[PDB]
Design a protein around this ligand. Structure first.
Ligand SMILES: CCCCCCCC(=O)OC[C@H](COP(=O)([O-])O)OC(=O)CCCCCCC
Lengths: 783, 322, 82, 85, 26
């Protein structure tokens, strides 16, 4: 019933990323927990008011011992205590004094106090440790003066009471969260041998065991019905995903129980080896996973963890400095919960971005091949509007009907824009035209040749633009999806006849705003589609400039079911809503005048980025589904372009990359919590205006020098004079168009600025002059 | 055996053909292969192997040419020329090299014995020095090199089989592979042996204070280098995700890292990075250059200068006040 | 009094910037480059692959004189000044 | 190390002095890096990246730090000598 | 080229110290 997995596929990143994230968060949480434990290992071992908290009238009703008081409340309780002074627990001593106990209980009848039976049974008559109102009045001044048996827990409110209605209910708040290990890493009471690191090891052991067992069950057990594709769909059937996680948790429960009972040493190494081998097994089995069973494995692991957290552990239990230590431990707990939330967000983002990194290598080779077998050089090097037809008749046509790899998936199309405003040739001039002479765009219908409507509508109709998918963008303007269309034919022989008919019937010479040839390709070996777009723009009659775009993408459809992109998108929406509501609450707690300081501007950016990523991914899925449904209906009748899907996929990938970059930067700046490593970032914050001033001065100096150079260079042709001597201090060889060509100079001047900063990088060393000084000041005061 | 080409790792099996000794026979064979079509759409890799001797010097040469046909279309060529020496003992210099080899073996044995003897008796921790991890690294590398040499020079049976029948293809690829591995290991070992010289350059107050400064600032440099590398990898992954499918220089993560390191040197061409993306293209380059040259490069100088200043000042104060 | 003496300097600077824009955008560089290519890079005669920028002999100069020089000199179109 | 690794394919490391000159030219950033990538896919890029990191970030700043400290100390000593007549 | 930076750094330190000591009593 067990099958050795085969070395199929190449590799799976989902399981590896999940295991790496779990190990990293475990290591960071272990570091934090050790920092807290060493703080509360040797040390740390409104309820109190100004009422008579002692009763010293007893005669022979005391002994040298201690006492304790346990109370419950709304997510708050108390514990034992031991205090003494100079009287050394005098007989019936009236000690009306309270220490900074953690007894943050409420105004409820939940309290039980008892002393130590040092010697014989004491029948002392002590009223109570009365407390009425000091800061919040969490108790009531109601003393009963009731006595119990020897060291027996005296009843109280706000000597043989041994019944399961009360004896067992004591553990409902005493050992409740002391053993619910998942929600107990920050509930460790003193006088216990837990160390708060054994809990972390047990938790990471449980997580790794769940992951490994689920990976084994999906990737090795396939002898019943192969447990894949037949009925175990990736979509939740409600009887398979839970039915494997619950069973996995039940089977793996005893090995965790053994280690827990051993703890309750050398078990650290045993648990480390066990989690290491489990992770290795999960990674080895991970290679044999199609995406559907991969998301099924993710959901099964989540279900098993939830079942362990909520189903088994709750039923497992049924078998000077003091005013700042509390603040520091509260800060540590906040750090822990924020770290857990951030690691969950980082895992979701990593799965959203690098979910399919195998196609990222194949897409590059596919687009390179499509360019090299389309003769991109021969297309980008055409300027007139009469070599288009020979280029198509010689290159493209043998590529469409030329049966080879990368099948066609739909006939090509040629759509033209008329502009109705026939252009005039211009004098040679410096060219570099922005083709602004365009006016309106033609919309009427025309017959064969051009305008001559005899009977009804023209044979060359406008074919009004589609609502979704347009705006190729270009030098002249931003186009759309409309234009006069020609289908170029189906067979190779008739295609040549159509091409020559368009040649000799006055089609492209006169008006011709654009040509807009477009294609699509399919690669089933890697399962990738490709959108190919070829465009020639005619700024003036007899002149053209070329553009080529090959966009490889993957056709992910919304109707496919519970895809990984869908899950990542819904998780990102949930995270964005959580961040937005938290920020809105915190902002409302301060009202107006919060727009000051970057603190409130780093949250809106994150929320907007997350929302944009999720919405763009959802839009891409919907557009892909709509386009596929449109295309499937009739193949040899329509083009059904896929450019919008490619653009949406590119935008979603860019947004995910930007979000991951921001998360990595945030992780980088959270390294300050080491005492000696907190200086660095601090200096970067304390020396910022100096860097701004240096940058402004350098920009002004560069502007002055650039003006000097531009005025000097544009004088005449080579004469070997002093002007070129002074201008030769830059741009390699007494002038190289400021090191970026003029055609590239009127294209994103920020890039040229960056290039010139890179070339003259010795000026930036001036910044060091500032930074060093600051580092000598900030570091000199911490000591 | 396997090859580990560029697209993937290729097996040692397939459909092979041994060519002939004369040109006419080989031409006829290749023409017959081309006529009855041999490279169809199903082909994925092609290998050509041969070898030459060049008897003037004593040095064989093994030539292997590989052509990869990816499933997405195209052709990727690669080559591998390797010079070997399998008839070592010919001249006097060969005997001198053999003597040096056995001397090296004796030296390695001596170092191993010293290491074991010193680790056994005292200093059972032994790893808080950084001058003992270098010793174990050097010993391990030299032992691995000696083992590879022993397993490589004694497995020259293929030469004996070839020399008794010179009308058959000689298999020299394993020897070339192990020669490359031995060369890499020897280069790393000699580099580390040279680095080990820093233990002995302490003969005056000028050299002692520089070593003290370096050892004292190593910790802070590592602490800041963690953040530096986190930012570096963030930029690398952003570039890989955005430009990775169009630029031919961000196609792989390691290629992105190397491209960034070349950008530091000023060895970048802006045309391709810009035409791949009108927006987010210039932003990436400009922000990377600015935050790498104006901030990260100067913080290292700040740390190093502060450490050197404090070290020099405290030695000077201690010496002048004793 | 600094603010008063600021606006005059900014007005002077903007006037100088307008003059600079007028100077640099005179589009004279294109004409010089075009006619330089017309006279220099043009081969002497199509039978010989040589031009003025790569002259090597006195006979090459004689070919250039009765050749590319006489072609470009007597033809966008230029008018001789004597 | 570069001589022993690339000393038979790259003709910038074909001789020891040529290796030194190529290493000096690497600092100026006028080396292709295309040949040394294909000469050895592993341990080739490692050498380049490690060399760049240790030259630009650890050894230039040390020279600058030494010069800074010495110049400041000299100015302080000269000022004390001149201002205490 | 590393000696101009020494002069600039030293001058910056001197100027900052002078400004800090002048501001203390004013
Ligand atoms: C204004 C001309 C700036 C061009 C500097 C030359 C470019 C350059 O690479 O020199 C930077 C230099 C560090 O040495 P290096 O980078 O040349 O290897 O660092 C320096 O020596 C900085 C000195 C410049 C400071 C003077 C500014 C008034």
């Amino acid at each position: 019933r067990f099958v050795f997995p085969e070395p199929t596929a190449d590799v799976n990143y989902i399981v590896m990323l999940t295991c790496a994230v779990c190990l990293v968060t475990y290591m960071v949480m272990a570091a934090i927990l050790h920092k807290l434990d060493q703080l509360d290992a040797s040390r740390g071992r409104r309820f109190k008011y100004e009422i008579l908290v002692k009763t010293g009238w007893g005669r022979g009703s005391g002994t040298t011992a201690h006492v304790g008081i346990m109370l419950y409340g709304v997510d708050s309780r108390s514990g034992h205590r031991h205090l003494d002074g100079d009287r050394a627990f005098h007989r019936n001593s009236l000690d009306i004094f309270r220490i900074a106990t953690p007894h943050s209980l409420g105004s409820v009848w939940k309290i039980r106090v008892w002393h130590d039976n040092k010697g014989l049974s004491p029948a002392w008559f002590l009223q109570h440790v009365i407390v009425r109102d000091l800061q919040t009045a969490r108790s009531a001044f109601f003393l009963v003066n009731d006595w119990l048996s020897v060291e027996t827990e005296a009843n109280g409110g706000l000597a043989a009471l041994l019944r399961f209605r009360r004896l067992l209910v004591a553990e409902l708040q005493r050992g409740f969260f002391d053993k619910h290990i998942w929600l107990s890493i920050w509930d460790r009471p003193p006088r216990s041998r837990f160390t708060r690191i054994q809990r972390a090891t047990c938790c990471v052991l449980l997580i790794c065991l769940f992951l490994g067992a689920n990976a084994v069950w999906y990737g090795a057990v396939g002898d019943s019905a192969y447990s894949t594709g037949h009925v175990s769909r990736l979509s939740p059937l409600s009887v398979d995903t839970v039915a494997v996680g619950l069973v996995s948790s039940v089977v793996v429960y005893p090995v965790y129980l053994a280690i827990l009972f051993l703890f309750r040493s050398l078990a650290h190494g045993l648990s480390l080896l066990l989690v290491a081998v489990a992770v290795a097994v999960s990674g080895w089995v991970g290679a044999s996973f199609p995406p559907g069973v991969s998301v099924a494995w993710l959901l099964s692991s989540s279900a098993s963890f939830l079942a362990s957290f909520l189903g088994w552990e709750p039923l497992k239990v049924l078998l000077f400095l003091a005013k700042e230590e509390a603040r520091k431990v509260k800060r540590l707990h906040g750090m822990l919960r924020s770290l857990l939330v951030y690691m969950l967000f980082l895992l979701v983002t990593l799965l959203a971005s690098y979910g399919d990194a195998s196609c990222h290598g194949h897409a590059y080779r596919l687009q390179s091949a499509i360019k090299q077998e389309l003769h991109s050089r021969a297309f980008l090097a055409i300027t007139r509007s009469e070599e288009l037809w020979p280029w198509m008749a010689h290159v493209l046509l043998p590529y469409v009907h030329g049966n080879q790899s990368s099948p066609e998936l739909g006939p090509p199309r040629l759509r033209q824009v008329r502009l109705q405003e026939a252009l005039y040739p211009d004098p040679p001039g410096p060219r570099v035209h922005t083709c602004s002479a365009a006016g309106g765009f033609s919309t009427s219908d025309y017959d064969v040749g051009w305008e001559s409507p005899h009977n009804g509508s023209g044979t060359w109709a406008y074919s009004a633009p589609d609502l979704l998918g347009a705006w190729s963008w270009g030098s002249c303007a931003v186009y759309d999806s409309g234009g006069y269309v020609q289908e170029l034919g189906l067979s190779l022989e008739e295609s040549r006849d159509r091409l020559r008919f368009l040649q000799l019937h006055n089609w492209l010479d006169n008006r011709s705003r654009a040509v807009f040839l477009e294609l699509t390709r399919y690669s089933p070996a890697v399962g990738l589609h490709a959108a190919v777009t070829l465009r020639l723009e005619f700024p003036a009659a007899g002149r053209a400039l070329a553009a080529l775009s090959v966009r490889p993408f993957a056709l992910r459809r919304l109707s496919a079911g519970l895809s990984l992109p869908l899950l990542t998108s819904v998780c990102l929406l949930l995270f964005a809503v959580h961040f937005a509501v938290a920020e809105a609450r915190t902002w409302h707690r301060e009202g107006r005048w919060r727009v000051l300081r970057l603190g409130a501007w780093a949250r809106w950016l994150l929320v907007a980025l997350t929302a944009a990523t999720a919405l763009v991914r959802l839009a891409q899925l919907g557009a892909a589904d709509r386009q596929w449904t449109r295309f499937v209906r009739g193949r040899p009748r329509r083009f059904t372009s896929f450019d919008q899907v490619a653009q949406l996929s590119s935008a979603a990938r860019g947004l995910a990359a930007s979000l991951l970059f921001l998360l990595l930067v945030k992780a980088a700046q959270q390294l300050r919590f080491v005492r000696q490593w907190s200086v660095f970032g601090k200096t970067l914050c304390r020396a910022l205006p100096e860097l701004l001033g240096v940058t402004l001065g350098l920009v002004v100096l560069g502007v002055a020098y650039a003006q000097l150079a531009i005025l000097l260079v544009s004088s005449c042709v080579d004469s070997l004079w002093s002007v070129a001597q002074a201008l030769l201090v830059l741009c390699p060889g007494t002038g190289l168009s400021t090191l970026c060509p003029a055609e590239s100079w009127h294209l994103s001047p920020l890039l040229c600025v960056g290039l010139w900063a890179l070339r003259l990088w010795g000026a930036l060393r001036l910044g060091a002059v500032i930074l060093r000084w600051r580092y000598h000041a900030l570091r000199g005061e911490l000591y | 055996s396997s090859h580990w080409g560029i697209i993937a790792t290729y097996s040692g099996a397939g459909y092979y053909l041994d060519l002939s000794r004369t040109r006419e026979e080989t031409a006829a064979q290749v023409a017959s292969l081309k006529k009855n079509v041999w490279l169809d759409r199903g082909t994925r890799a092609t290998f050509i192997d041969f070898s030459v001797y060049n008897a003037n010097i004593n040095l064989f040469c093994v030539v292997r040419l590989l052509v990869e046909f990816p499933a997405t279309g195209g052709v990727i060529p690669s080559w591998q020329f390797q010079p070997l020496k399998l008839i070592r003992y010919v001249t006097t210099f060969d005997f001198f090299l053999a003597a040096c080899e056995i001397i090296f073996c004796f030296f390695i044995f001596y170092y191993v014995v010293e290491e074991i003897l010193e680790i056994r008796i005292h200093k059972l921790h032994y790893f808080r020095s950084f001058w003992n991890c270098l010793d174990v690294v050097i010993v391990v590398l030299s032992v691995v090199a000696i083992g590879i040499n022993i397993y490589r020079t004694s497995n020259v049976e293929v030469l004996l089989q070839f020399l008794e029948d010179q009308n058959t293809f000689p298999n020299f690829e394993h020897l070339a592979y192990w020669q490359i591995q031995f060369n890499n290991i020897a280069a790393v070992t000699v580099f580390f042996v040279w680095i080990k010289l820093f233990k002995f350059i302490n003969f005056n107050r000028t050299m002692s204070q520089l070593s003290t400064t370096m050892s004292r600032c190593a910790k802070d440099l590592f602490g800041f280098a963690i953040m530096f590398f986190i930012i570096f990898l963030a930029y690398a992954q952003l570039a890989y995700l955005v430009f990775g499918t169009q630029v031919d220089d961000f196609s792989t993560f390691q290629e992105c890292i190397f491209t960034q390191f070349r950008i530091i040197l000023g060895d970048i061409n802006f045309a391709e990075i810009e035409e791949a993306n009108r927006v987010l293209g210039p932003i990436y380059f400009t922000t990377f250059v600015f935050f790498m040259f104006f901030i990260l490069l100067n913080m290292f100088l700040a740390i190093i200068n502060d450490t050197y200043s404090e070290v020099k000042s405290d030695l000077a104060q201690q010496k002048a006040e004793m | 009094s600094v603010l008063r003496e600021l606006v005059t300097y900014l007005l002077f600077l903007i006037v100088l910037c307008i003059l600079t824009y007028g100077m640099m955008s005179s589009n004279v560089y294109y004409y010089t480059r075009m006619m330089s290519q017309l006279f220099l890079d043009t081969p002497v005669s199509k039978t010989e692959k040589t031009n003025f920028k790569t002259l090597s002999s006195m006979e090459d100069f004689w070919k250039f004189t009765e050749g590319s020089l006489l072609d470009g000199l007597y033809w966008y179109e230029n008018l001789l000044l004597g």
